[PDB]
Design a binder for this molecule. Structure first.
Ligand SMILES: OC[C@H]1O[C@H](O[C@H]2[C@H](O)[C@@H](O)[C@@H](O[C@H]3[C@H](O)[C@@H](O)[C@H](O)O[C@@H]3CO)O[C@@H]2CO)[C@H](O)[C@@H](O)[C@@H]1O
Length: 380
């Protein structure tokens, strides 16, 4: 007879300030179970690192990411099924979309701990009323834009997911998960991309890089940032008094066109080749179904609980940041689990790379047509 012993190794791509929150939870857990070491290990290119290490027996026990990898990782045999651990009682602890995010074709491979998307994070010392329409957003942008003094109207990391809200504001889509077809060359999608680079890019420092954009906001050199819960401890460490609201509707002849960001469910995944399964299960189950664990992720970072019970906690119900991300998620599209999405993301990031070579003059329509076809050829 025995106990669970040893180590649980968890790979991730969190930056240090987000990680701190997760490490303090690990430390609590290790206080609860002194015979179990929880070890977090940062990977620059986590998806690449897992693909390479998992099959060779060099991968971790667990890893953290949004849910959309679960389809392609399972098809590649890179995950460990946990069907034997999942029960209806456990499933019923989670919101249905978290219930669905944690499985692929009938097998469970993870536990869910949050919902997320990007939203406007605004600095209350620079913006006293956040924008409820794109027009008010643009006026705030105009008010603060002053590149000569290294001041910009907004901070916004640029990549497929980060600008999907705007790309998809006018009925466009990267991918229709009904028909399972990319939508890059739909006029409404083209309209959304042009809108980003015509209406919003001119107010930015002209770089798509994540930490450069974020640092502009953290340094008070932009009044607003488009980012997710994963960035919130960075905002807090910078001493900024902030709020969170959804990207507001663009108005066209009195009509609203709501930006529609992609969003997702955060999962702790079980990796194929896992060495310490029962210990890793116990930690994950704790992390995802203990009230104080989930309350801590939500109150510290703005993560929206998918642990139903805590949604009724007054601590959670009266919290501004979780409410604002929650409002943003209401307009979000849940990322598909289809492995087809892999080439979609590649196609959209490829188009953005070419647009960024010459954003003011690029032929966005023809680029998008070009990448639609590449996606159509690489989709599987
Ligand atoms: O752009 C294509 C990718 O879009 C999706 O990735 C999203 C994540 O889903 C989302 O969580 C967010 O990731 C951040 C992560 O949460 C945080 O812990 C880490 O420290 O930083 C990440 C951002 O740099 O944003 C990315 C988009 O960058 C999708 O999940 C992924 O498969 C696509 O490749």
């Amino acid at each position: 007879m025995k106990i669970e012993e040893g180590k649980v190794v968890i790979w991730h791509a969190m930056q240090p300030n987000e990680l701190e929150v997760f490490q303090s939870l690990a430390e609590e857990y290790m206080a609860l179970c002194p015979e179990v070491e929880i070890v977090f290990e940062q990977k620059p290119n986590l998806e690449d690192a897992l693909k390479a290490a998992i099959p060779t027996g060099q991968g971790p026990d667990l890893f953290i990411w949004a849910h959309d990898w679960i389809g392609k990782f399972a098809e590649a045999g890179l995950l460990e099924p946990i069907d034997e651990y999942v029960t209806e009682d456990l499933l019923n602890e989670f919101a249905p979309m978290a219930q669905d995010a944690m499985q692929y074709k009938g097998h469970y491979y993870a536990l869910p701990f949050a919902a997320e998307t990007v939203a406007i994070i605004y600095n209350k010392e620079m913006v006293s009323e956040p924008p409820k329409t794109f027009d008010e957003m643009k006026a705030i942008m105009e008010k603060y834009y002053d590149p000569a003094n290294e001041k910009y109207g907004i901070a916004w990391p640029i990549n497929a997911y980060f600008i999907s809200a705007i790309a998809q504001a006018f009925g466009g889509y990267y991918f229709d998960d009904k028909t399972e077809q990319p939508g890059l060359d739909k006029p409404e999608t083209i309209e959304g991309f042009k809108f980003f680079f015509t209406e919003i890019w001119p107010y930015m420092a002209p770089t798509g890089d994540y930490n450069t954009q974020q640092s502009i906001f953290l340094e008070g050199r932009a009044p607003m940032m488009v980012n997710g819960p994963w960035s919130i401890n960075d905002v807090k460490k910078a001493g900024i008094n902030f709020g969170v609201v959804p990207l507001p509707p663009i108005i066209k002849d009195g009509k609203e066109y709501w930006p529609r960001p992609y969003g997702g469910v955060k999962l702790i995944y079980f990796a194929a080749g896992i060495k310490n399964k029962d210990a890793a299960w116990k930690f994950a189950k704790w992390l995802t179904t203990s009230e104080e664990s989930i309350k801590t992720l939500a109150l510290e970072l703005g993560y929206i609980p998918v642990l139903t019970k805590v949604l009724d906690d007054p601590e959670i119900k009266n919290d501004p940041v979780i409410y604002g991300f929650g409002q943003a998620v209401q307009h979000a599209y849940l990322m598909p689990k289809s492995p087809k999405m892999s080439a979609v993301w590649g196609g959209v990031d490829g188009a953005i790379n070419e647009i960024l070579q010459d954003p003011q003059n690029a032929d966005i329509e023809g680029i998008l047509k070009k990448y639609q076809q590449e996606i159509l050829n690489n989709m599987q």
